[PDB]
């Protein structure tokens, strides 16, 4: 019981330290910037063919092809420009909760309630290539670090880095208390962050194999996380209908995004090319467009008949695509 006193003493010490470094709030500095203004968008393409609700999607590195997964047990690779299909890969397990597209464009991975991550080969038709096992809980997200190693986060309060060629775990990241829900990698692929179910987002270093920092601004479960293009900040979305912009060097949050007319949860968060606009999905059957530096809403992306569960922006910053439980994908511009 000595530790409870000890740990409590340290937590008190850090809070004073972060506090001293507050020369001024970001809203104080960002007060005279000309507003972005109203942002009007219209849907350009509508992709149909899915039998059930959609949970995940991921844009290709060429801003041309994308992948999506549904509860019908089927991955489909579309063609954004010509709105026609390219591939359709069946699945052994009908419950999938994530998908990813390799940076080289040769592999696609997916996981689900069954505790296995599967990798498919697209440039041989398409047949399962490798099955990775070892997690004791359902997978939540997975991202391709490179063409030979993949990092996954599961529901058993752990994250791990895999080796595709050998199929064995290389490093294991522990320290969370509740389930892990999402992650995002640094642009230079040296660090990544994860949002847990205990309202705490942590920073990891694959090379260090050890946690570096922790942020505890929220008060409910964390559903999604996105990383600022600079590499020194990230944004989070939780179940308390709020978005918060954290920071790495300052080691404390800067601004919060919320409105009094919305009481629903948040499902996805993404940035734009320049990082000026923060696009976030909601459970209110539509999407909102925020302002990164002033926290003023500048548009609404409506048109979905059910909740939005996916959101992604092309590497070229040309179009933003959304997914919903209505089994329909859209391309906005």
């Amino acid at each position: 019981d000595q530790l409870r006193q000890e740990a409590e003493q340290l937590k008190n010490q850090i809070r004073d330290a972060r506090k001293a470094c507050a020369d001024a709030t970001l809203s104080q500095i960002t007060n005279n910037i000309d507003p972005v203004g109203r942002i009007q968008m219209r849907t350009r393409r509508t992709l149909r063919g899915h039998l059930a609700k959609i949970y995940a999607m991921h844009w290709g590195t060429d801003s041309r092809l994308l992948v999506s997964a549904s509860q019908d047990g089927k991955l489909i690779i579309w063609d954004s420009y010509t709105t026609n299909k390219v591939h359709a890969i069946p699945l052994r397990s009908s419950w999938v909760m994530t998908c990813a597209y390799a940076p080289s464009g040769n592999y696609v991975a997916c996981g689900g309630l069954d505790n296995i991550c599967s990798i498919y080969n697209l440039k041989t038709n398409v047949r399962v290539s490798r099955e990775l096992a070892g997690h004791t809980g359902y997978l939540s997200c997975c991202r391709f670090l490179d063409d030979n190693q993949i990092v996954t986060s599961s529901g058993d309060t752990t994250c791990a880095l895999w080796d595709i060629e050998t199929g064995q775990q290389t490093t294991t990241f522990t320290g969370h208390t509740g389930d892990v829900m999402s992650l995002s990698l640094a642009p230079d692929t040296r660090l990544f962050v994860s949002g847990a179910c205990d309202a705490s987002a942590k920073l990891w270093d694959v090379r260090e194999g050890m946690c570096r920092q922790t942020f505890t601004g929220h008060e409910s479960d964390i559903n999604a996380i996105c990383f600022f293009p600079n590499g020194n900040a990230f944004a989070t979305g939780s179940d308390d209908a709020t978005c918060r912009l954290f920071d790495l060097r300052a080691d404390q949050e800067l601004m919060t995004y919320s409105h009094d007319n919305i009481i629903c949860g948040i499902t996805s968060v993404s940035f734009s090319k320049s990082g000026r606009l923060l696009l976030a999905g909601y459970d209110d059957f539509n999407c909102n467009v925020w302002d990164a530096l002033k926290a003023d809403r500048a548009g609404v992306l409506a048109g979905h008949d059910n909740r939005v569960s996916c959101l992604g922006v092309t590497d070229d910053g040309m179009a933003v695509a959304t997914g919903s439980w209505d089994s329909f994908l859209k391309i906005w511009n």
Binding site: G49, L51, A52, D72, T82, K85, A88
Partner: protein
């Protein structure tokens, strides 16, 4: 130029395959099998067969598809099961004198399932296993249910009670008391959107599949009746 034609041909082939698969997807009914530990969830599944353990059966040219999950106090993955036909709940009725007695935990789990936001319109088929173990302990038994449940004193056998042949007037009271402890939590917050079907199950029983079939048919019929505003 011909690349567009080849891509269109591939699109057409994929579309034909998807159209073929759509009917098979719509034909089947999906069931979720949920219960506590030592409940008997695996067994009932074995009788139907003759990380997630799937199974399929076909009755009267109608095919069903059952899923058994799993271990966490909060289940976030339960939001993915809002399109199932029904949820099968399995509880051990004889464990009121074991280990926070196992029943009260089962009651709390059932209450948590019933009031979940994502499962507002999902019916629950309730199975009461170990009927045999309960009677041997309940009658010609060392201990009473009262000690573990004070409300048993102010409870009378329901008049509607319909005892099967050869059973004592105490074991019937115990069985119907256990059933009413679940029926109370079901009736109060439903709003008529969803219902519960109590049942009595033992190890030597062969009519479970027919019961599930009849319950699914009743659920579908009641949903259709409510949709058209006749109920």
């Amino acid at each position: 130029r011909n690349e567009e034609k080849a891509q269109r041909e591939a699109n057409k082939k994929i579309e034909k395959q998807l159209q073929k698969d759509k009917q098979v997807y719509r034909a089947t009914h999906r069931l979720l099998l949920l219960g506590a530990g030592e409940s008997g969830k695996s067994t009932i599944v074995k009788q139907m067969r003759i990380g997630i353990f799937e199974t399929k059966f076909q009755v009267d040219k109608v095919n069903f598809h059952m899923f058994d999950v799993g271990r966490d106090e909060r289940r976030k993955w339960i939001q993915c099961f809002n399109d199932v036909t029904a949820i099968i709940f399995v509880v051990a009725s004889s464990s009121y004198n074991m280990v926070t007695n196992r029943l009260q935990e089962a009651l709390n789990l059932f209450k948590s399932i019933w009031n979940n936001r994502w499962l507002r319109t999902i019916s629950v088929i309730l199975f009461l296993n170990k009927q045999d173990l309960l009677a041997e302990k309940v009658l010609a038994g060392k201990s009473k249910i009262e000690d573990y449940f004070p409300e048993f004193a102010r409870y009378t056998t329901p008049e509607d009670a319909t005892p099967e042949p050869g059973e004592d007037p105490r074991v019937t009271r115990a069985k119907y008391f256990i059933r009413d402890e679940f029926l109370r939590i079901s009736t109060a917050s439903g709003d008529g959107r969803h219902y519960c079907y109590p049942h009595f199950t033992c190890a030597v029983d062969t009519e479970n599949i027919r019961r599930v079939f009849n319950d699914c048919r009743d659920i579908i019929q009641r949903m259709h009746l409510r949709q058209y505003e006749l109920l």
